[PDB]
Kruppel-like factor 3
Amino acid sequence: GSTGIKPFQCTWPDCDRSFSRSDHLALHRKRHMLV
Ligand SMILES: [Zn+2]
């Protein structure tokens, strides 16, 4: 279903990801800035 309305939303425009896991979106975001 529509599970894009998440509080842990990735703020990458071309990506447009949204998470429920803080430990997942953290690494997802770390790899975004290539760190
Ligand atoms: Zn992302």
